[PDB]
Amino acid sequence: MLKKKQLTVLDLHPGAGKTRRVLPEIVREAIKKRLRTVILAPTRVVAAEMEEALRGLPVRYMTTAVNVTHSGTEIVDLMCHATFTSRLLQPIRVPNYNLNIMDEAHFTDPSSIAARGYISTRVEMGEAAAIFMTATPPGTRDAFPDSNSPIMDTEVEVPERAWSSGFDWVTDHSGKTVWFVPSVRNGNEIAACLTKAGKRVIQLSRKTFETEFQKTKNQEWDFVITTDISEMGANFKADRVIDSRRCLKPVILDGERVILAGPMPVTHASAAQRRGRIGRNPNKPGDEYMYGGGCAETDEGHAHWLEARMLLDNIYLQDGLIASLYRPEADKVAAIEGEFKLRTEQRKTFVELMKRGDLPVWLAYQVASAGITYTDRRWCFDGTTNNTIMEDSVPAEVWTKYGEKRVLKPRWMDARVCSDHAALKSFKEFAAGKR
Numbered sequence: 001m002l003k004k005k006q007l008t009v010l011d012l013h014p015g016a017g018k019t020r021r022v023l024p025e026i027v028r029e030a031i032k033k034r035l036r037t038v039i040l041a042p043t044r045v046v047a048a049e050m051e052e053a054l055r056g057l058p059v060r061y062m063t064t065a066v067n068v069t070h071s072g073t074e075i076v077d078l079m080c081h082a083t084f085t086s087r088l089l090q091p092i093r094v095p096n097y098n099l100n101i102m103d104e105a106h107f108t109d110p111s112s113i114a115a116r117g118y119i120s121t122r123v124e125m126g127e128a129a130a131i132f133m134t135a136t137p138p139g140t141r142d143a144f145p146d147s148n149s150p151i152m153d154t155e156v157e158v159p160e161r162a163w164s165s166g167f168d169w170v171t172d173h174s175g176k177t178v179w180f181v182p183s184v185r186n187g188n189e190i191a192a193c194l195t196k197a198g199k200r201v202i203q204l205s206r207k208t209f210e211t212e213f214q215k216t217k218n219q220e221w222d223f224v225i226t227t228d229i230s231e232m233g234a235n236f237k238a239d240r241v242i243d244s245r246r247c248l249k250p251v252i253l254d255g256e257r258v259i260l261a262g263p264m265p266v267t268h269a270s271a272a273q274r275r276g277r278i279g280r281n282p283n284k285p286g287d288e289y290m291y292g293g294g295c296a297e298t299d300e301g302h303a304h305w306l307e308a309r310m311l312l313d314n315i316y317l318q319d320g321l322i323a324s325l326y327r328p329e330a331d332k333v334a335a336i337e338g339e340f341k342l343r344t345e346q347r348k349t350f351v352e353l354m355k356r357g358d359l360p361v362w363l364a365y366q367v368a369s370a371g372i373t374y375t376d377r378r379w380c381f382d383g384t385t386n387n388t389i390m391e392d393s394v395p396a397e398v399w400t401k402y403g404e405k406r407v408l409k410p411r412w413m414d415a416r417v418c419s420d421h422a423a424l425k426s427f428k429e430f431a432a433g434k435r
């Protein structure tokens with residue numbers, strides 16, 4: 001695997017030992033061969049689990065999720081997928097790693113797709129080797145792969161709202177369940193229904209993941225209600241997965257707005273990953289997987305692939321060349337390579353709106369390409385009446401940095417800035433000039 005050119009896809013089934021068994025062997029060989037190596041973790045939780053599997057080995061942890069006193073002589077760096085992509089975009093020089101290892105290489109967030117694009121392009125140019133570790137490579141059509149122990153698979157109607165009757169099997173269970181819901185708001189309703197029935201529930205989503213995940217180890221629970229973020233290496237000591245088989249899909253309409261379409265079917269890769277949370281202990285056969293819908297290729301036309309192109313167009317590769325998306329996932333978007341390339345100043349605004357502004361990639365691009373500077377928030381208020389953001393059935397209001405009370409009405413509407421209470425609160429703070 002460890003030779004210039006060559007991208008290897010390590011596709012062992014979920015729980016086969018890619019992270020705890022194969023990864024340390026690869027790292028030992030890389031260090032023996034003096035290969036400058038990067039290990040890409042999807043989340044800070046996976047970064048912490050990787051330190052445990054790699055303990056002793058000289059690895060430089062470029063994350064605050066690990067508390068290690070480095071020696072300065074490490075030739076292996078470990079960082080999150082987003083950090084790698086972020087450093088590539090920023091003026092900081094990123095080493096030209098001879099070996100690029102991506103754990104949970106199926107992650108569909110824009111920064112993970114862009115990282116795959118950049119790395120596979122360097123490999124195609126003959127400059128580096130790469131290893132993509134995932135049980136579900138792009139384009140997988142099997143939602144029921146192998147497991148460490150047999151799983152009972154059952155197609156059943158799964159509630160997506162609070163219920164009074166008709167789903168006794170859900171609450172009659174005496175074990176631990178991980179339940180995948182299509183959104184934070186849908187999970188809040190199911191969590192409330194289960195709590196009212198006497199169950200102890202933990203909720204996980206992208207924003208709360210590190211803090212709330214600790215509770216799955218620190219306390220006794222009956223249910224974990226989670227969004228699709230738990231498909232990325234989140235390990236639970238559970239005996240059942242309930243899977244709605246649904247997700248929200250960001251869709252760019254007329255090149256002018258982003259809506260959260262659906263809920264709609266998950267991909268086969270997402271279903272296999274959700275199911276893959278259980279059946280991991282060869283001594284506990286019979287873990288259950290209850291699923292409530294079929295799979296579909298909902299990654300085609302999904303905004304994340306277009307956002308990945310906006311990122312790759314603004315990353316230096318060599319002269320005017322631009323990194324292409326990883327070949328198996330390149331047809332998911334219809335885009336011209338280079339169409340989102342920004343001049344140095346607008347590029348800096350683009351980066352700062354994502355990094356400091358915490359805006360979605362698509363929204364950051366619309367603001368930066370319009371020649372608007374980072375601190376100029378007049379665009380949050382001068383959109384059409386149909387772009388009015390609503391808070392509890394009434395127009396949302398903020399005090400501008402000037403001291404004026406105004407209705408939140410952005411020139412570009414992206415549904416992700418107000419898809420839950422937390423997102424709308426962060427967007428209100430941005431529109432007010434508070435970051």
Ligand SMILES: CCS/C(=N\c1ccc(CC)cc1)NC
Pocket residue numbers: 402403404405
């Ligand atoms: C706070 C009261 S309004 C204010 N600025 C303006 C000025 C003009 C207009 C358009 C009539 C709106 C707003 N600053 C504090």
